[PDB]
C-alpha cells in the first residue's frame, strides 16, 4: 500500500533548481543532513528531560554515516525524535513553503546557495548528489514509515516493513553515478572535519569490507 503525493509547487521549484543549477560546492549536503540529525537529537533530548520514558525506544543519541559502494548509497542514521507520517507528508517536518520563499528572497539579496540551511530547507540539498532519496523514520507516537522521492514532482509514503529502528531517522542517498567520491572514507572524513567538527553528538563513520 503505497501513497503517492505531489510536492507543493514551491518545493518542486526548489528541487528542480537544486538539480539543474550549475554549482560545484556539492559537499555541503552532508553538513546539512548532519545538522538536521543534530536538531532531531536535540528535540528528543529536550523531551526526555521531563519524561525519561521518551528514551525507552533507545537511550543512545548518535549519528552514523554508512557508505555502501555495492549499492552506491550513503546513509545518514540518527536516533533523534523521528517523524510521524503527518510530519513526512508535511515536507519532512519543515516549513518548506515559507523557507523556500525566504531562501529565494535571500539569494536575490546576495546570500549564497550554501546558506540553504539557514532557511529550514537544507534537507533538499541531498539532491545535489542523490538521484533518489529514501527516508526511513520512527517517532515514538507513530509507526515506522518510508518516504521516497526521485524528484520529478512527487514523493511516496508507505509503511516500512524493513528493519525496525526503534526511534530516529535514516536518510538513504542513492548517489548519482558521478558523485561516488562521497562513498570514499577519506572524502567523508574531510567533509565532516571541515563542516561538522563541533556537532555535539558522536558521528561514527562506518568502514566497508
Ligand atoms: N538560483 C540559483 O542558482 C540557486 C539557488 C539555490 C540553490 F540551492 C541552488 Cl543549488 C542554485
Swiss-Prot record:
Residues reported in the UniProt entry to bind ATP: 36, 78, 97, 123
Interaction with NR3C1: region residues: 1-209
Effect on the protein upon substituting residue 78 to A: Impaired ATP-binding. Strong interaction with HIF1A, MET, KEAP1 and RHOBTB2. Loss of interaction with HSF1 and ERBB2. Los of interaction with TSC1
Subcellular location(s) per record: Nucleus; Cytoplasm; Melanosome; Cell membrane
Domain of life: Eukaryota
PTM remark: ISGylated.
N6-acetyllysine modified-residue sites: 43, 69
Role noted for this protein: Molecular chaperone that promotes the maturation, structural maintenance and proper regulation of specific target proteins involved for instance in cell cycle control and signal transduction. Undergoes a functional cycle that is linked to its ATPase activity which is essential for its chaperone activity. This cycle probably induces conformational changes in the client proteins, thereby causing their activation. Interacts dynamically with various co-chaperones that modulate its substrate recognition, ATPase cycle and chaperone function. (Microbial infection) Seems to interfere with N.meningitidis NadA-mediated invasion of human cells. Decreasing HSP90 levels increases adhesion and entry of E.coli expressing NadA into human Chang cells; increasing its levels leads to decreased adhesion and invasion.
Subunit and interaction comment: Homodimer. Identified in NR3C1/GCR steroid receptor-chaperone complexes formed at least by NR3C1, HSP90AA1 and a variety of proteins containing TPR repeats such as FKBP4, FKBP5, PPID, PPP5C or STIP1. Forms a complex containing HSP90AA1, TSC1 and TSC2; TSC1 is required to recruit TCS2 to the complex. The closed form interacts (via the middle domain and TPR repeat-binding motif) with co-chaperone TSC1 (via C-terminus). Interacts with TOM34. Interacts with TERT; the interaction, together with PTGES3, is required for correct assembly and stabilization of the TERT holoenzyme complex.
Domain notes: The TPR repeat-binding motif mediates interaction with TPR repeat-containing proteins like the co-chaperone STUB1.
Family statement: Belongs to the heat shock protein 90 family.
Name this polypeptide is given: Heat shock protein HSP 90-alpha
Amino acid at each position: 500500500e503505497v501513497e503517492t503525493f505531489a510536492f507543493q509547487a514551491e518545493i518542486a521549484q526548489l528541487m528542480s533548481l537544486i538539480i539543474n543549477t550549475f554549482y560545484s560546492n556539492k559537499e555541503i549536503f552532508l553538513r546539512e543532513l548532519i545538522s538536521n540529525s543534530s536538531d532531531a537529537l536535540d528535540k528528543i533530548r529536550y523531551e526526555s528531560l521531563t519524561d525519561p520514558s521518551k528514551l525507552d525506544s533507545g537511550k543512545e543519541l548518535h549519528i552514523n554515516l554508512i557508505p555502501n559502494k555495492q549499492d552506491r548509497t550513503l546513509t545518514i542514521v540518527d536516533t533523534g525524535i523521528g517523524m510521524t507520517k503527518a510530519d513526512l507528508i508535511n515536507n519532512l517536518g519543515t516549513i518548506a513553503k515559507s523557507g523556500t520563499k525566504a531562501f529565494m528572497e535571500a539569494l536575490q539579496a546576495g546570500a549564497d546557495i550554501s546558506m540553504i540551511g539557514q532557511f529550514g530547507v537544507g534537507f533538499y540539498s541531498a539532491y545535489l548528489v542523490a538521484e533518489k532519496v529514501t527516508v526511513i523514520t520512527k517517532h515514538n507516537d507513530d509507526e515506522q514509515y518510508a518516504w521516497e522521492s526521485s524528484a520529478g514532482g512527487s514523493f511516496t509514503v508507505r509503511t516500512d516493513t524493513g528493519e525496525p529502528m526503534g526511534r530516529g531517522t535514516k536518510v538513504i542517498l542513492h548517489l548519482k553515478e558521478d558523485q561516488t567520491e562521497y562513498l570514499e572514507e577519506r572524502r567523508i572524513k574531510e567533509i565532516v572535519k571541515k563542516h561538522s567538527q563541533f556537532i555535539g553528538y558522536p558521528i561514527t563513520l562506518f568502514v566497508e569490507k
